[PDB]
């Protein structure tokens, strides 16, 4: 993997682990602005930050970005999308992502939704 | 405060799902994008003017210049799966990606 993607992923992950979720999202924005290509680990970490912040709008923007980037089939990314929608209070959207995928149980999706409510 | 480059909530990705018995042709999918957009905007002329990009391969959806209130009208329409704010795929070129649509002219990506 490209060293700059490694570096951004590690900083984003470290900021997430430190509970500095807004700072992780700021780094991700810069990554995209500078033309540095996120990978499935980038998307997973930043969608987790969105889920923990309730940043549904950025989560939906990332969803569109993932769809267009061919990450449509990626298990790591779709798990993170499901987690983001369920923790942002949109079980029906999490269900639609779940139904797109080819493990994860719907019980766990519902549990995540209920525990965030 | 944080938004993806190009996401201004006046550009929207509308992802559709199509049948498989049979799967529609590429042209049928494009006609479906325009028909769906025309249903919401009120005319095919306005649909053709405001659809700026689409895909029938990587994704099966279209991208259009509409406001956020208008994007809400797509939810629940037949075949509409996702209604999402669009974003650049090529930030330097301010390019939203997809095959391009210029008021009736298709330019493959």
Swiss-Prot record, chain B:
Record protein name field: Multiple organellar RNA editing factor 9, chloroplastic
Signal peptide: none
Entry GO CC: chloroplast; chloroplast envelope; chloroplast stroma
MF terms in GO: mRNA binding; protein dimerization activity; protein homodimerization activity
Keyword Oxidoreductase appears in the UniProt entry: no
Cystine pairings recorded for this chain: none
Gene: MORF9
Keywords of this entry: Chloroplast, mRNA processing, Plastid, Transit peptide
Purpose: Involved in organellar RNA editing. Required for the processing of multiple editing sites in plastids.
Primary location: plastid
Subunit structure: Homodimer and heterodimer with MORF2. Interacts with protoporphyrinogen oxidase 1 PPOX1. Heterodimer with MORF5/RIP5. Interacts with PCMP-A2/PMD1. Interacts with ORRM6.
Knocked-out gene: effects: White leaves with green islands, giving a variegated appearance. Mutant plants can grow autotrophically on soil.
Family according to the record: Belongs to the MORF family.
GO biological process: chloroplast RNA modification; cytidine to uridine editing; mRNA processing
Compartment(s): Plastid, Chloroplast
């Amino acid at each position: 993997v490209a060293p700059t993607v490694v570096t951004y992923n590690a900083l984003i992950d470290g900021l997430c682990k430190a509970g500095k979720l807004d700072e992780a999202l700021k780094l991700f924005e810069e990554m995209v602005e500078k033309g540095i290509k996120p990978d499935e680990f980038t998307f997973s970490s930043v969608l987790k930050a969105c889920a923990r912040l309730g940043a549904l709008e950025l989560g939906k923007q990332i969803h569109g970005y993932v769809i267009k980037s061919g990450f449509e089939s990626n298990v790591v990314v779709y798990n993170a999308l499901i987690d983001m929608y369920s923790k942002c209070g949109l079980l029906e959207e999490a269900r639609k992502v779940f139904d797109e995928m080819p493990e994860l149980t719907y019980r766990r999706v519902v549990e995540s939704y209920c525990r965030a409510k | 405060t944080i938004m993806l480059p190009g996401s201004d909530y006046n550009h929207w990705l509308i992802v559709m799902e199509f049948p498989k018995d049979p799967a529609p042709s590429r042209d049928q999918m494009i006609d479906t994008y325009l028909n769906t957009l025309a249903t919401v905007l009120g005319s095919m002329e306005e649909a053709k003017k405001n659809m700026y990009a689409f895909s029938t391969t990587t994704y099966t959806g279209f991208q259009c210049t509409i406001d956020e209130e208008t994007s809400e009208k797509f939810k629940g329409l037949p075949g509409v799966l996702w209604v999402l704010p669009d974003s650049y795929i090529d930030v330097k070129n301010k390019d939203y990606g997809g095959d391009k649509y210029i008021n009736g002219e298709i330019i493959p990506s």
